[PDB]
Design a protein around this ligand. Sequence first.
Ligand code: VZS
Length: 284
Amino acid sequence: PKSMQCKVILLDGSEYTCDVEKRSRGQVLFDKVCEHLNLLEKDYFGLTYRDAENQKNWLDPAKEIKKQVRSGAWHFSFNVKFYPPDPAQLSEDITRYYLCLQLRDDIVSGRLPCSFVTLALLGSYTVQSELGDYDPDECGSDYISEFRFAPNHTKELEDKVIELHKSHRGMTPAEAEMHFLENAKKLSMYGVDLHHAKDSEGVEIMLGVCASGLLIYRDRLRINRFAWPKVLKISYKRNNFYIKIRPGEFEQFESTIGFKLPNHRAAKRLWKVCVEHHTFFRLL
Ligand SMILES: COc1ccc(C)cc1NC(=O)Nn1cnnc1
């Protein structure tokens, strides 16, 4: 049996290295990573790889790893795929812990926009979790945390994190992580996966996929929202992605909204993440 070396970037930024048989399907590697992480509530998560065009792709657990990575290295990241709308209802604190780590990266990367005050508040809960109670021995007037909190750090952001950290005395890591999640879940882009596209007139839009449904970000004004029940069907053909929307009651026929993606693979990628979001959050 010939085995291939796999490298996985974990949500703490560490590397996990393991072997799988070269013909292995994605589920084999995922199960090894989740066992390494002591994770039981696994199906919120997944593995990503970067394709020949440098796009993020989800590793399909039903398909051979080699038929997905194809010409690329067997290098993956462990990520949240399906962001729970109500993290309090997760059964395990370790699940919430990994979800916090993902959201911290979503924030630092700028995928999850966040006000100044909420950046500082989330940062303060992270510090309480990682370091425990505020200690003025480590923190002077000139303190800057090792923790990345934001896409752009400023001294006043660092100061606000400390001021808020002082308020959290006695809070345990699990408590701080639950407060982090109860704040982060309210952000308008929480768990929204964004895809570049053009509308039927050729205007550049972003299509957002999340638990609640589909979002069409045309500009700061005119955000179109389709809750999953309103979405009758989704399809792709060539570089085109199509959403069928149910008619109001007493309407005869569903409406079709068409989008142009950069290429055929971007259209398939969007269709699949939409189907998967429909599939796991039809149930959950
Ligand atoms: C109950 O599990 C599901 C249900 C629906 C869907 C869409 C997915 C899963 N899980 C899943 O794919 N787990 N996994 C394996 N490798 N990466 C992630």
